[PDB]
Scaffold this active site. Structure first.
Site, mmCIF file in Angstrom:
data_model
loop_
_atom_site.group_PDB
_atom_site.id
_atom_site.type_symbol
_atom_site.label_atom_id
_atom_site.label_comp_id
_atom_site.label_asym_id
_atom_site.label_seq_id
_atom_site.Cartn_x
_atom_site.Cartn_y
_atom_site.Cartn_z
ATOM 1 N N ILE A 14 0.810 -1.206 0.000
ATOM 2 C CA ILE A 14 0.000 0.000 0.000
ATOM 3 C C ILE A 14 0.847 1.259 0.000
ATOM 4 O O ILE A 14 0.290 2.362 -0.009
ATOM 5 C CB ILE A 14 -0.984 0.010 1.189
ATOM 6 C CG1 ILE A 14 -0.275 0.406 2.490
ATOM 7 C CG2 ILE A 14 -1.671 -1.359 1.333
ATOM 8 C CD1 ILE A 14 -1.241 0.618 3.663
ATOM 9 N N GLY A 15 2.180 1.122 -0.019
ATOM 10 C CA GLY A 15 3.153 2.198 0.080
ATOM 11 C C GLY A 15 2.805 3.506 -0.577
ATOM 12 O O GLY A 15 2.486 3.558 -1.766
ATOM 13 N N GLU A 16 2.838 4.566 0.220
ATOM 14 C CA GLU A 16 2.686 5.925 -0.275
ATOM 15 C C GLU A 16 3.791 6.817 0.281
ATOM 16 O O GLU A 16 4.938 6.748 -0.173
ATOM 17 C CB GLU A 16 1.316 6.490 0.104
ATOM 18 C CG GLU A 16 0.135 5.812 -0.565
ATOM 19 C CD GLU A 16 -0.126 6.330 -1.967
ATOM 20 O OE1 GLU A 16 0.713 6.090 -2.861
ATOM 21 O OE2 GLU A 16 -1.173 6.980 -2.173
ATOM 22 N N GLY A 17 3.447 7.664 1.251
ATOM 23 C CA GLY A 17 4.438 8.529 1.876
ATOM 24 C C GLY A 17 5.138 9.406 0.857
ATOM 25 O O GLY A 17 4.547 9.847 -0.134
ATOM 26 N N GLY A 20 8.205 6.451 0.431
ATOM 27 C CA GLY A 20 8.522 5.497 1.472
ATOM 28 C C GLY A 20 7.720 4.227 1.290
ATOM 29 O O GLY A 20 6.508 4.283 1.070
ATOM 30 N N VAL A 21 8.383 3.079 1.369
ATOM 31 C CA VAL A 21 7.746 1.808 1.045
ATOM 32 C C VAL A 21 6.925 1.344 2.241
ATOM 33 O O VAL A 21 7.477 1.037 3.303
ATOM 34 C CB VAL A 21 8.790 0.758 0.648
ATOM 35 C CG1 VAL A 21 8.148 -0.346 -0.169
ATOM 36 C CG2 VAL A 21 9.922 1.414 -0.131
ATOM 37 N N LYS A 37 6.732 -0.698 7.201
ATOM 38 C CA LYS A 37 7.387 0.375 6.467
ATOM 39 C C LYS A 37 8.822 -0.024 6.154
ATOM 40 O O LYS A 37 9.578 -0.393 7.061
ATOM 41 C CB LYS A 37 7.363 1.680 7.265
ATOM 42 C CG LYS A 37 8.012 2.855 6.551
ATOM 43 C CD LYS A 37 7.807 4.147 7.325
ATOM 44 C CE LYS A 37 8.386 5.345 6.589
ATOM 45 N NZ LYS A 37 8.176 6.612 7.346
ATOM 46 N N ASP A 127 4.486 18.379 10.046
ATOM 47 C CA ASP A 127 4.044 17.757 8.802
ATOM 48 C C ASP A 127 2.529 17.597 8.788
ATOM 49 O O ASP A 127 1.997 16.561 8.383
ATOM 50 C CB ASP A 127 4.733 16.409 8.593
ATOM 51 C CG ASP A 127 4.713 15.959 7.144
ATOM 52 O OD1 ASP A 127 4.444 16.798 6.259
ATOM 53 O OD2 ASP A 127 4.963 14.761 6.892
HETATM 54 N N1 LIG Z 1 0.085 9.927 2.428
HETATM 55 C C1 LIG Z 1 0.201 9.079 3.170
HETATM 56 C C2 LIG Z 1 0.359 7.935 4.170
HETATM 57 C C3 LIG Z 1 -0.739 7.182 4.555
HETATM 58 C C4 LIG Z 1 -0.579 6.143 5.467
HETATM 59 N N2 LIG Z 1 0.668 5.868 5.980
HETATM 60 C C5 LIG Z 1 1.070 4.922 6.869
HETATM 61 C C6 LIG Z 1 0.163 3.889 7.537
HETATM 62 C C7 LIG Z 1 0.056 3.841 8.922
HETATM 63 C C8 LIG Z 1 -0.778 2.888 9.484
HETATM 64 N N3 LIG Z 1 -1.458 2.040 8.736
HETATM 65 C C9 LIG Z 1 -1.371 2.067 7.420
HETATM 66 C C10 LIG Z 1 -0.561 2.985 6.769
HETATM 67 C C11 LIG Z 1 2.422 5.072 7.050
HETATM 68 C C12 LIG Z 1 3.350 4.257 7.949
HETATM 69 C C13 LIG Z 1 4.306 4.914 8.706
HETATM 70 C C14 LIG Z 1 5.162 4.193 9.519
HETATM 71 C C15 LIG Z 1 5.069 2.812 9.568
HETATM 72 F F1 LIG Z 1 5.912 2.099 10.368
HETATM 73 C C16 LIG Z 1 4.118 2.152 8.809
HETATM 74 C C17 LIG Z 1 3.262 2.877 7.999
HETATM 75 N N4 LIG Z 1 2.826 6.078 6.295
HETATM 76 C C18 LIG Z 1 1.735 6.581 5.623
HETATM 77 C C19 LIG Z 1 1.600 7.644 4.696
#
Ligand SMILES: N#Cc1ccn2c(-c3ccncc3)c(-c3ccc(F)cc3)nc2c1
Ligand SMILES: [Cl-]
Length: 306
Positions: A14-17, A20-21, A37, A127
């Site tokens: 589902i990677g976005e950020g 960031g994977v 992540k 942020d």
């Molecule tokens: N734009 C945008 C966006 C949307 C959702 N996330 C998440 C996320 C968080 C909890 N559940 C699902 C997804 C994370 C993330 C951060 C740290 C981690 F260790 C794991 C996931 N980063 C993002 C960015």
């Protein structure tokens, strides 16, 4: 060996950020889903190490996912926390890119409480964006509770043992999403507690109007773009953003914009100020959100909405 973290099997991507994977996972000891992540070790921007310590610092607080694992699998840095539901930006688009007055209010008090608990732990977020505020998942007790994630931009503003605010400074490059950052951020000022609250104000008017006047502005490069967004933020007062809207939002943004650098902002005064909005309109702060009504009342779907 696809499983990482000893106890977390890789699921859906589902990677976005910021590229960031991010991955879906599940704990093979109890089947609970997680959000995994990834991050290259030999990269030009190490950050996942300190984000792991950030969740541990805010561990136990409502709206902060629990940090479960940080390891060194292969050539990737891995952080495992709680998987959560869609972002407020996801629900925003699905609700027609506009939120009712009731939803934005109840949302604002939860965001203000989350940001208050962050500043309570001597950290600023820097942020603020609706892509980083998530609801829980279906069936959970916090399915519609708004959570905060992504602390890769979290900076300490006061030491934990003398509680002294960092000194004011200037000359800091404009890093982040220019659509919601504060006016002081555009001017290169060192951010503090008041800048996490002005950005919250921008998000409130963003949810209310469906857009912002400093959106879609054209400029040659991004510096002038980041600049051109700053001009309109200072050209339009808070009253013109409140046009046809409850004036308590204009008061909120104006108040948090006149806050001094090191002051503790009256968190509960702003939340009560936003609570009184539901008094002038005759609505009950029960919890009912806009996204509790799509798809015939089922909620939100995956193949039709997203
Ligand atoms: N734009 C945008 C966006 C949307 C959702 N996330 C998440 C996320 C968080 C909890 N559940 C699902 C997804 C994370 C993330 C951060 C740290 C981690 F260790 C794991 C996931 N980063 C993002 C960015
Ligand atoms: Cl934009």
């Amino acid at each position: 060996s696809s499983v990482v973290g000893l106890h977390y099997k890789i699921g859906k991507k589902i990677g976005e950020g910021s590229f960031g994977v991010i991955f879906e996972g599940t704990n093979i000891i109890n089947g609970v889903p997680v959000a995994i992540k990834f991050e290259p070790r030999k990269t030009e921007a190490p950050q996942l190490r300190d984000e792991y310590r950030t969740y541990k610092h805010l561990q136990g607080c409502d709206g902060i996912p629990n940090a479960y694992y940080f390891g060194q699998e292969g050539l990737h840095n891995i952080l495992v926390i709680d998987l959560l539901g869609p972002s407020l930006e996801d629900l925003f688009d699905w609700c027609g890119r506009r939120f009712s007055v009731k939803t934005v209010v109840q949302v604002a008090i939860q965001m203000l409480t989350l940001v208050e608990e962050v500043h309570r732990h001597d950290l600023i977020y820097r942020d603020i964006k609706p892509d980083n505020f998530l609801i829980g998942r279906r069936g959970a007790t916090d399915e519609n509770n708004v959570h905060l994630i992504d602390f890769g931009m979290a900076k300490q503003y006061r030491d934990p043992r003398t509680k002294q605010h960092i000194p004011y400074r200037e000359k800091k490059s404009l890093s982040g999403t220019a659509r919601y950052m504060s006016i002081n951020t555009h001017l290169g000022r060192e951010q503090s507690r008041r800048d996490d609250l002005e950005a919250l104000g921008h998000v409130f008017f963003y949810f209310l109007r469906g857009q912002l006047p400093w959106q879609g502005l054209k400029a040659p490069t991004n510096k002038q773009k980041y600049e051109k967004i700053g001009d309109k933020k200072r050209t339009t007062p808070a009253v013109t953003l409140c046009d046809g809207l409850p004036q308590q939002f204009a008061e909120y943004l104006d108040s948090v914009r006149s806050l001094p650098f090191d002051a503790e902002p009256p968190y509960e005064e702003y939340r009560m100020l936003l609570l009184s909005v539901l008094d002038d309109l005759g609505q009950a702060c029960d919890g009912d959100m806009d996204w509790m009504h799509l798809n015939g009342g089922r909620g939100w779907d995956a193949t039709i909405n997203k």
